[PDB]
């Protein structure tokens, strides 16, 4: 797998692995049992003819010929961890939804759910929460919920509410989410904000069509004004 | 503008404007969806082991 | 003809199943396969065997092979026994009646666990396929379907009603709340599965693959939203296998706790939870120690922690065997001493027991007083072979031969010896010849008891097969070492000749009349040896691979063999020739049989299913399907009436021969939901169904529902045929959706088109009612309509300037 000539070969983890260096001044981890290259360090500019190793290849210490040492610091364990606590985190995120959702818990929900990126949900919990609202826009906690969204939060939503916005079965949630960005936010952070412009330019046209209809459906109900002045007479 | 497949390989975009993230999906639904894509699809000798 | 039916099933003392253990030390319920098997300690013996029924081969028998127990669960109080099998199924079965009353199946797959709540009202059974059911006793339904876990629930806890943990293959905990029917708080186990969990009060141990074992706080009124179940300390138990099973066990009089952690390896390791006293003067003893250290501190408070989950509890004993450990079981507690009884994976159970007092147990070792092989071999059965009599029979496997009475079904002696292959019953049957793995030679006698004498260099290598003449005085020895030998009695075993092959003899198999020897080989041709004249006759060729058992019809013009290829041939005597070649076994035949003076033959398979068929017919009469695991041998009585196969599982066996339209749809859902709504008014008015009960929605939700049921392309014509009186009930539900604000918004546009097509279809005849009260009916549907519509005009009008202003804002900024 080198791509030049190997000068220096230690094992390291003791019979598990080994460390290999060559002149294109990559260093390889190799498995020595499955003979595959588990990992590529390129710390260096130019060939490598020093490779020193200590704590059964904890510490990895490389010299260039340019003069420049990377000194390696193994941390398996670490990210180990990390991972470990990310996946820990991401259950207690959506049995939480669960729970919210269940208990009807909206404007905790629809944090969980724009962090999970869950979208029926997502939707789920718009449109039972605008049924509610039914009975300034949604309600003042979710009214607040949505204006701390930041920029990146604000992109997922509207995204999604382009989506629906296409759909006549569902334009009504969407449009309503929107006028709360609108009402809650400063228009100008929202035009400045990479990628918005062409996301927004997609929702007139339909915005527009459901404008025409409705209208229509607005328009045509005057023939119960006509039933009652016809009983009038 | 039309809706399309979802930029995300971890969801399911319909051509309704709606959108599933296959973590959520229960079982049952991803099942079926599955089914739903197929129908979419396909119309468009050593001698000790002898004895023991 | 006359089906074969499976008589007895006997030789297996238990199966891998969990064990029940009752106290009068007690007495055991072991598996035995499909069949349930009851036991007692102190006499160390079977006490009854509950067979449910459908005899195997029997037509109302199922063709397919009945399935083992995965689960036993009993209630002492009860009394009664249930059962799960493979097919998720359960069986109860009563203690005392030894026979079914009750059936369940709501698990699509195997059984992983069987509970009984403390009244014994009802089950929580939890099965490989994620579904977990509640079965009630005297419903004999289940309440409620648990999934929320996406892979097998390796266990689950349920001391209390209001709430349940559950372990799974997923590596999840699942607080599960059994009023709500959903579970409520999720959180990992471990990285790895979780295979064992058990419970102490608050304190809630979780065995991972690894050695590492987790203990979670459970405070069950925390409601906090989270933290429900929270971690103490992580301890790693000696065993690198996983726990499969945990139990703790406490002593009433000195209030001491002790746990035994069902390790995957042999050993079992058994821990004591020290007495909070005993926890808080030995944490005192180890602040003090650590203030000797030097340690900072925050480090004395980081080494307690880490020995915080040490202090609870502490080592008490671990438990080694010989062989690996399927089950385990807390038995008994007291002050004197503990008991507890395990069942091995090789089908024997051995009672433990451990005196202790204060800290450390007295005992230095486990004892087990209690041990059963007398009715069991821990090694399998290779070679079985039966006595001219009838009365006897014997069962050669690795390390034993067991001789068992048909009649009796008790073994009568056992024999100590090697790795048997074959085995072959001596002339007169006062003796019996086996062979193996080493290569000697053994000679058995009934009589005396024991083998009579070894000869250890009487072959190099082992002898895979061996014969015997019909007169007996000739004995002929099959083996590797790619050499026969023949040896002759006298009353000394001394051998007479040698014969050279190029190949290893697969099977030495000799004929009645001893005219002729068949010997098969690893190169796939099966030659013939005439055995007077010593000298080779023919050699049968074609087989796909090695002949694995060689046969001889009584008039001795045929040569049934059976071989690895899986396809058994039929060579006729006078030519050597093949009249058929049959794929019988999916898996390869290892032993076939005749039906002695007939053309039938009987055959086995590693498939473990034995076929019937007929030389002239050339089909199967009957197919047999009762072995779990794979038959490893089968034996032909010389009466012919009883056939013994004996499984890899230990079990010994033996078969004896005997509409409503659309649009309609709507007008009875007007009739159903507005009759309700006039019986409310009339109701109201006063003061100042049972299908609708089961539907528990809203009458104008119901009818909601419908409409949407109803096709749009077939809504208007289902409108059209609406008789008018039905449309001043239309009106009517139409008032009452807008008394509910939320209804309409729901569904707006579809509520509205429909009072449109009503209203143009019936203008001319609506404008002739002067019904005052339905003009205002009239009157306040428009009013909330034109709010409705004006609102969503309102909202979606706002987006669109407003929108509108911030591109053109964009678009000035860009250009």
Redesign the interface.
């Known amino acids: 797998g080198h791509t030049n000539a190997v000068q220096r070969c230690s094992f390291i983890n003791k019979q598990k692995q080994l460390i290999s260096c060559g002149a294109d001044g990559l260093i390889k981890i190799w498995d020595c049992s499955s003979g595959e290259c588990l990992k590529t360090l390129d710390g260096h500019n130019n060939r490598l003819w020093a490779l020193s190793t200590m704590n059964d290849g904890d510490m990895i210490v490389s010299a260039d010929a340019d003069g420049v040492f990377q000194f390696w610091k193994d941390c398996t364990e670490q990210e180990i961890e990390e991972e470990?606590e990310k996946?820990?985190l991401q259950?207690?995120q959506?049995?939480?939804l669960?729970?919210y959702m269940?208990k009807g818990d909206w404007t905790n929900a629809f944090l969980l759910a724009m962090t999970?990126?869950?979208?029926?949900?997502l939707?789920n919990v718009l449109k039972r929460a605008?049924?509610?609202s039914?009975?300034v826009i949604f309600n003042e906690e979710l009214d607040q919920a949505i204006s701390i969204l930041n920029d990146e939060q604000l992109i997922l939503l509207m995204k999604?509410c382009?989506?629906?916005?296409?759909?006549?079965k569902?334009h009504?949630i969407a449009?309503?989410t929107?006028?709360c960005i609108?009402m809650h936010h400063n228009?100008?952070k929202?035009?400045e904000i990479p990628g918005?412009?062409k996301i927004?330019?997609?929702?007139?046209?339909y915005?527009?069509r459901?404008?025409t209809r409705?209208?229509n459906?607005?328009e045509?109900?005057y023939?119960?004004?006509?039933?009652?002045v016809?009983?009038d007479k | 503008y039309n809706v399309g497949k979802a930029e995300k390989d971890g969801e399911i975009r319909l051509k309704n404007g709606v959108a599933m993230s296959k973590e959520e999906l229960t079982r049952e639904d991803k099942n079926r969806l599955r089914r739903a894509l197929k129908r979419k699809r396909s119309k468009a000798p050593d001698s000790t082991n002898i004895k023991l | 003809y006359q089906r074969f039916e499976q008589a007895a099933a006997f030789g297996v003392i238990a199966s891998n199943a969990n064990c029940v253990w009752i106290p009068a030390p007690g007495q055991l319920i072991t598996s035995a396969l499909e069949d349930v098997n009851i036991w007692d300690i102190k006499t160390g013996d079977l006490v009854s065997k509950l067979s449910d029924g459908l005899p195997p081969g029997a037509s109302d028998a199922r063709g397919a092979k009945p399935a083992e127990c995965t689960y036993l669960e009993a209630h002492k109080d009860t009394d009664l026994l249930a059962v799960g099998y493979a097919d998720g199924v359960i069986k109860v079965w009563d203690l005392m009646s030894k026979t079914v009353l009750l059936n369940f199946n709501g698990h699509k797959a195997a059984i992983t666990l069987l509970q009984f709540d403390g009244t014994g009202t009802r089950l929580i059974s939890g099965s490989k396929d994620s579904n977990i059911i509640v079965w009630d006793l005297v419903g004999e339904v289940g309440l409620y379907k648990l999934r929320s876990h996406k892979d097998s629930i390796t266990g689950f806890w349920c001391q209390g009603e209001d709430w349940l943990i559950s372990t799974s293959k997923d590596g999840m905990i699942k607080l599960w709340d059994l009023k709500t029917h959903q579970c409520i708080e999720t959180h990992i186990a471990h990285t790895g599965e979780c295979w064992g969990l058990a419970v102490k009060d608050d304190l809630l141990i979780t065995t991972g693959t690894d050695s590492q074992v987790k203990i979670w706080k459970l405070d069950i009124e925390n409601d906090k939203m989270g933290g429900k179940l929270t971690e103490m300390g992580i301890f790693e138990k000696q065993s690198k296998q996983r726990g499969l099973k945990i139990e703790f066990i406490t002593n009433s009089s000195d209030k001491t706790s002790f746990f035994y952690i069902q390790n995957a390896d042999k050993t079992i390791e058994t821990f004591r939870i020290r007495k909070e006293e005993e926890i808080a003067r030995g944490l005192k003893k180890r602040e003090k120690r650590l203030k000797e250290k030097g340690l900072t501190e925050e480090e004395i408070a980081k080494s307690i922690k880490e020995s915080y989950s040490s202090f609870i509890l502490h080592p008490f004993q671990t438990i080694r065997s010989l062989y690996k450990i399927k089950s385990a079981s807390w038995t008994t507690v007291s002050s004197s001493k503990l008991e507890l009884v395990l069942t091995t994976s090789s089908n024997t159970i051995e009672y433990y027991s451990i005196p202790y007092e204060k800290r450390d147990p007295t005992s230095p070792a486990p004892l087990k007083t209690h041990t059963i092989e007398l009715q069991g071999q821990r090694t399998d059965v290779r070679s079985i072979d039966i006595s001219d009599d009838n009365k006897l029979l014997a069962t050669a496997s690795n390390g034993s031969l067991k001789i068992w009475n048909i009649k009796t079904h008790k073994c009568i002696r056992t024999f100590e010896c090697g790795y048997a292959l074959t085995c072959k019953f001596l002339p007169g049957g006062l003796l019996v010849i086996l062979g193996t793995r080493n290569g000697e030679l053994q000679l058995f006698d009934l009589a005396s008891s024991s083998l009579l004498d070894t000869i250890e260099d009487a072959h190099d290598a082992a002898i895979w097969s061996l014969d015997l003449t019909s007169d007996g005085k000739r004995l002929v020895t099959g083996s590797a070492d790619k050499t026969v030998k023949f040896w002759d009695f006298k009353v000394k075993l001394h051998h007479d000749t040698t014969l050279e092959l190029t190949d290893d003899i697969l099977c030495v198999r000799v004929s009645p009349d001893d005219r002729y020897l068949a010997i098969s080989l690893l190169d796939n041709t099966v030659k013939v040896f005439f055995l007077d004249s010593m000298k080779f006759y023919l050699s049968l060729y074609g087989h796909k691979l090695p002949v694995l058992s060689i046969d001889i019809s009584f008039d001795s013009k045929m040569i049934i063999t059976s071989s690895a290829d899986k396809n058994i041939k039929i060579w006729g005597l006078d030519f050597g020739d093949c009249h058929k070649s049959l794929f019988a076994h999916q898996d390869s035949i290892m032993n076939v049989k005749f039906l002695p003076q007939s053309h039938n033959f009987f055959s086995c398979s590693k498939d473990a299913v034995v076929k019937y068929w007929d030389g002239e017919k050339f089909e199967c009469i009957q197919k047999l399907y009762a072995h779990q695991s794979e038959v490893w041998a089968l034996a032909v009585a010389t009466d012919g009436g009883f056939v013994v196969s004996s499984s890899h599982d230990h079990s010994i066996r033996i078969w004896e021969e005997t509409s409503l339209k659309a649009g309609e749809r709507l007008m009875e859902a007007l009739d159903l939901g507005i009759a309700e709504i006039e019986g409310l008014e009339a109701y109201n008015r006063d003061m100042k169904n049972a299908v609708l009960i089961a539907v528990n929605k809203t009458p104008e939700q119901y009818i909601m529902d419908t409409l949407l049921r109803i096709r749009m392309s077939q809504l208007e014509d289902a409108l059209m045929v609406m008789p008018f009186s039905y449309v001043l009930k239309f009106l009517k539900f139409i008032d009452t959706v807008m008394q509910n604000k939320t209804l309409l918004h729901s569904h707006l546009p579809l509520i509205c088109k429909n009072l449109f097509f009503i209203i143009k279809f019936n203008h001319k005849e609506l404008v002739s009612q002067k019904n005052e009260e339905l003009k205002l009916q009239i009157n306040r549907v428009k009013t909330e309509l034109r709010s409705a519509l004006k609102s969503t005009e309102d909202d979606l009008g706002f987006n669109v300037q407003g929108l509108k202003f911030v591109k053109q804002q964009w678009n000035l900024r860009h250009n």
């Open positions: 470990q996946a820990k259950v207690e959506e049995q939480s669960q729970n269940s999970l990126d869950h979208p029926m949900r939707f605008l049924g509610e039914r009975s999604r382009r989506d629906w916005n296409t759909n006549a569902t009504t449009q309503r929107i006028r609108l228009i100008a929202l035009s918005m412009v927004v330019d997609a929702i007139i046209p915005t527009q459901h404008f409705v209208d459906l607005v045509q109900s023939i119960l004004d006509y039933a009652l016809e009983m």
